[PDB]
Amino acid sequence: TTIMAVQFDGGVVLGADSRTTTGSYIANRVTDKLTPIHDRIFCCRSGSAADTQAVADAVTYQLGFHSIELNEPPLVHTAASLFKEMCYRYREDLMAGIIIAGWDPQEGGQVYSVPMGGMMVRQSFAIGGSGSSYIYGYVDATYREGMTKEECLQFTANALALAMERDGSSGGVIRLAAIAESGVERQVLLGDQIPKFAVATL
């Protein structure tokens, strides 16, 4: 898996590859690893498919109930704290590397990492999963403060494409989402729409 999210002024961009593996068998080549937790809050999931689905379902439940009781949209920081609480408490029984990203009216676009072990840190952009190793250098060199939504989408697609090329556990299609006050926009890059970089022939 490769997962990523990036803050911009007014929102966030999230992406993931789409590969689920058991050993080196691809059990799903078009996985949707970006899961809605509330109207403008998503999580990107890496690690164990079972663990991350169960935790996402449980947090969706907690956050939905909390939000009805308060009669307001939830804070992105609150969704992240709920993930963290569960991933930290059960760190010995779960294999879950999560990015929480979304928009709320109080703090705008936000990205939180909850890596394995259950720490939580806010970041300008976050990457995770096995494929993220291959793109640390790329993102460190390419990230610019003040990118637009469209630049964040391009940056995310490029990063994920590079990771997918090199990581056996990542591949398939790129799923993107943009979240802002006006809502959620989802898309898929497939086939020729995935950014392409030549293999280096002599």
């Binding site: 609150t78 704290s81 709920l82 963290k84």
Partner: protein
């Protein structure tokens, strides 16, 4: 008789044990809260039952979270236990959700705990009413009041205890929406002096607290010199 248990309705649909608990509140001396442009101010008529007690003994104003004050009337040991419930609910909210409990949610949670003590023969209703006040830039000023049945509402101004109606009628004279906390403390002190029956009960302390823009959203005792000035304004206003 139909009035021995909170699990027994009377034939007209009343729960007399809750109504009796309310009488305990109505026998107590008066507490007031006022919401204004930039926060909330609390005042209590704290009756001094012996000159042997220290100034500050038996406080009726509590901090339940750094941003939340509580003002009580009724049976004081029940009120303190409720302050501890409120403290724990605020604490557990921060631990679970990672931010400061919104006032309304804190009021509704402790109200439901109060309400749970009005259904059963196994326990008795709390003999207390209390106000909760806070301020933040995001939420503004908020003042809630909870009674022994567990009802919770928001207020511009509120009074509990035995001179409740006399207090309310004075509070209604203020345009509190356009006043600051510094102006309101004087008016709180004034109103406590108006409704205090100096013939029937000889000695009292004024207790004052506030939360607002001026305390940076922290619930705090009103400083000694401001309280003394407020008392002096109230006393001369009584003239």
């Amino acid at each position: 008789g139909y009035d021995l248990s909170a699990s027994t309705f009377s034939p007209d649909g009343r729960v007399f044990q809750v109504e009796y608990a309310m009488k305990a509140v109505e026998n107590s001396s008066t507490a007031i809260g006022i919401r204004c442009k930039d926060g909330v101010v609390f005042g209590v008529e704290k009756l001094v039952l012996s000159k042997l007690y220290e100034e500050g003994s038996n406080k009726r104003l509590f901090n339940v979270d750094r941003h939340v004050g509580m003002a009580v009337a009724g049976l004081l040991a029940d009120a303190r236990s409720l302050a501890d419930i409120a403290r724990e609910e605020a604490s557990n909210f921060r631990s679970n959700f990672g931010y400061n409990i919104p006032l309304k949610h804190l009021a509704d949670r402790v109200a439901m705990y109060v309400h749970a003590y009005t259904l059963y023969s196994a326990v008795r209703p709390f003999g207390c009413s209390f106000m909760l006040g806070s301020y933040s830039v995001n939420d503004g000023a908020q003042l809630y009041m909870i009674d022994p049945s567990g009802v919770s509402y928001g207020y511009w101004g509120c009074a509990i205890g035995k001179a409740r109606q006399a207090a309310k009628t004075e509070i209604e004279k203020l345009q509190m929406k356009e006043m600051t906390c510094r102006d309101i403390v004087k008016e709180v002190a004034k109103i406590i002096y108006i409704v205090h029956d100096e013939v029937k009960d000889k000695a009292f302390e004024l207790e004052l607290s506030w939360v607002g823009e001026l305390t940076n959203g922290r619930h705090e005792i009103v400083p000694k010199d401001i309280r003394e000035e407020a008392e002096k304004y109230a006393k001369e206003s009584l003239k």
